[PDB]
């Protein structure tokens, strides 16, 4: 019996949900930052 | 549980063990470097504290 | 009878996992060869022919309807078992109740993440 890549999130135990959340929070933060930058660029490029 | 539940759990724990072994090795290397750099900084900081404990 | 006479009915089989056991006992005592987990071969049919009678007649046939709410019982959440999977592939929606949610304080334990309903949009009031 072996182990394969992407198995922690295949089991779906506690580590799977923990990893999913650790990813989602970080990328929500980065999406917020990128959206702020996109708004700034929009405003600065109207003229 | 059933056989598939056990198989998935076993695979996940095996991955976790691999990752923790790798991280132990990385931390050990960084520790060796940190001690090496800590000796001179130890003497430097102790000297900088010298005054207050002397006066 | 109700759905054929223009009226509406709701039926609640509780459980179907025990009708399956009674059918298995009958079939084993008639000497019919067993199948998987000792259930007869015709154990899907047993339920499919039963849950297919919950129809929604058009207005030409009275307009009556017969909703069905079969109740299955899994073993330690093993939805992957035999009768659970049969009935899940027979029915339209599902309502997953979980003990981890029952004890965590969420009652009814409905696992909204997995619970499904094919009709969805339709069969819902506009405010809801």
UniProtKB/Swiss-Prot annotation, chain A:
Annotated region described as Disordered, given as residue ranges: 1-20
Recorded consequence of changing residue 26 to A: Strongly impairs F(1)F(o)-ATP synthase-binding
UniProt-reported outcome of changing residue 20 to A: Impairs F(1)F(o)-ATP synthase-binding
Domain characteristics, as noted in the entry: Forms an alpha-helical dimer with monomers associated via an antiparallel alpha-helical coiled coil composed of residues 74-106, leaving each N-terminal inhibitory region (residues 26-62) accessible for interaction with an F1 catalytic domain. The inhibitory N-terminal region (residues 26-62) binds the alpha(ADP-bound)-beta(ADP-bound) (ATP5F1A-ATP5F1B) interface of F1-ATPase, and also contact the central gamma subunit (ATP5F1C).
Chain positions of site Participates in pH sensing: 19, 42
Function description: Endogenous F(1)F(o)-ATPase inhibitor limiting ATP depletion when the mitochondrial membrane potential falls below a threshold and the F(1)F(o)-ATP synthase starts hydrolyzing ATP to pump protons out of the mitochondrial matrix. Required to avoid the consumption of cellular ATP when the F(1)F(o)-ATP synthase enzyme acts as an ATP hydrolase. Indirectly acts as a regulator of heme synthesis in erythroid tissues: regulates heme synthesis by modulating the mitochondrial pH and redox potential, allowing FECH to efficiently catalyze the incorporation of iron into protoporphyrin IX to produce heme.
Impact upon substituting residue 28 to A: No effect on F(1)F(o)-ATP synthase-binding
UniProt-annotated location(s): Mitochondrion
Domain of life: Eukaryota
Phenotype when changing residue 42 to K: Retains its inhibitory activity at pH 8.2 and does not form a homotetramer at high pH
Resulting phenotype, residue 32 to A: Strongly impairs F(1)F(o)-ATP synthase-binding
Species, as recorded: Bos taurus
Complexes and interactors: Homodimer; represents the active form and is present at a pH value below 6.5. Homotetramer; represents the inactive form and is present at a pH value above 7.0.
Gene that encodes the chain: ATP5IF1
Effect of residue 35 to A: Impairs F(1)F(o)-ATP synthase-binding
Stated name of the protein: ATPase inhibitor, mitochondrial
From Swiss-Prot, chain B:
Modified-residue entries (N6-succinyllysine), positions: 24
Residues modified to N6-acetyllysine: 14, 30
Compartment(s) of residence: Mitochondrion inner membrane
Coiled-coil intervals, chain numbering: none
Disulphide bonds in the chain: none
Assigned protein family: Belongs to the ATPase gamma chain family.
Known role: Subunit gamma, of the mitochondrial membrane ATP synthase complex (F(1)F(0) ATP synthase or Complex V) that produces ATP from ADP in the presence of a proton gradient across the membrane which is generated by electron transport complexes of the respiratory chain. ATP synthase complex consist of a soluble F(1) head domain - the catalytic core - and a membrane F(1) domain - the membrane proton channel. These two domains are linked by a central stalk rotating inside the F(1) region and a stationary peripheral stalk.
Assembly: Component of the ATP synthase complex composed at least of ATP5F1A/subunit alpha, ATP5F1B/subunit beta, ATP5MC1/subunit c (homooctomer), MT-ATP6/subunit a, MT-ATP8/subunit 8, ATP5ME/subunit e, ATP5MF/subunit f, ATP5MG/subunit g, ATP5MK/subunit k, ATP5MJ/subunit j, ATP5F1C/subunit gamma, ATP5F1D/subunit delta, ATP5F1E/subunit epsilon, ATP5PF/subunit F6, ATP5PB/subunit b, ATP5PD/subunit d, ATP5PO/subunit OSCP.
Name recorded for this polypeptide: ATP synthase F(1) complex subunit gamma, mitochondrial
Originating organism: Bos taurus
Gene label: ATP5F1C
Swiss-Prot record, chain C:
Post-translational modification: Acetylated on lysine residues. BLOC1S1 is required for acetylation.
Residues where N6-succinyllysine is found: 7
Tissue expression remark: Heart muscle (at protein level). Heart and liver.
Site (Required for activity) residue list: 115
Family of this protein: Belongs to the ATPase alpha/beta chains family.
Note in the entry: The siderophore enterobactin (Ent) produced by enteric bacteria binds Fe(3+) and helps bacteria scavenge iron ions from the environment. As a consequence, the mammalian siderocalin LCN2 plays an important role in defense against bacterial infections by sequestering iron bound to microbial siderophores. LCN2 can also bind iron bound to endogenous or nutrient-derived iron chelators and plays an important role in cellular iron homeostasis.
Oligomeric form and interacting partners: Homotrimer. Component of the ATP synthase complex composed at least of ATP5F1A/subunit alpha, ATP5F1B/subunit beta, ATP5MC1/subunit c (homooctomer), MT-ATP6/subunit a, MT-ATP8/subunit 8, ATP5ME/subunit e, ATP5MF/subunit f, ATP5MG/subunit g, ATP5MK/subunit k, ATP5MJ/subunit j, ATP5F1C/subunit gamma, ATP5F1D/subunit delta, ATP5F1E/subunit epsilon, ATP5PF/subunit F6, ATP5PB/subunit b, ATP5PD/subunit d, ATP5PO/subunit OSCP.
Name of this chain's protein: ATP synthase F(1) complex subunit alpha, mitochondrial
Species per Swiss-Prot/TrEMBL record: Bos taurus (Bovine)
Designated gene of the protein: ATP5F1A
Included stretch of the parent chain: 299 to 426 of 553
């Amino acid at each position: 019996v072996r182990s394969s890549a992407g198995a922690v999130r295949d089991a779906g135990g506690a580590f799977g949900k923990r990893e999913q959340a650790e990813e989602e929070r970080y990328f929500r933060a980065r999406a917020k930052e990128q959206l702020a930058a996109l708004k700034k660029h929009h405003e600065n490029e109207i003229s | 549980a059933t056989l598939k539940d056990i198989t998935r759990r076993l695979k996940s724990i095996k991955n976790i063990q691999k990752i923790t072994k790798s991280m132990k090795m990385v931390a050990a290397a960084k520790y060796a470097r940190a001690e090496r750099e800590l000796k001179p900084a130890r003497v430097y900081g102790v000297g900088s504290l010298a005054l207050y404990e002397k006066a | 009878y109700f759905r054929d006479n223009g009226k509406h009915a709701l039926i609640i089989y509780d459980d179907l996992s025990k009708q399956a056991v009674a059918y298995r006992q009958m079939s084993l005592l008639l000497r019919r060869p067993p199948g998987r987990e000792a259930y007869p071969g015709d154990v899907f049919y047993l339920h499919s022919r039963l849950l297919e009678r919950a129809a929604k007649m058009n207005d030409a046939f009275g307009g009556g309807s017969l909703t069905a709410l079969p109740v299955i019982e899994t073993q330690a959440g093993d939805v992957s078992a035999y009768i659970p999977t049969n009935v899940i592939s027979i029915t339209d929606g599902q309502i997953f109740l979980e003990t981890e949610l029952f004890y965590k304080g969420i009652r009814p334990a409905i696992n909204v993440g997995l619970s499904v309903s094919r009709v969805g949009s339709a069969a819902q009031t506009r405010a809801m």
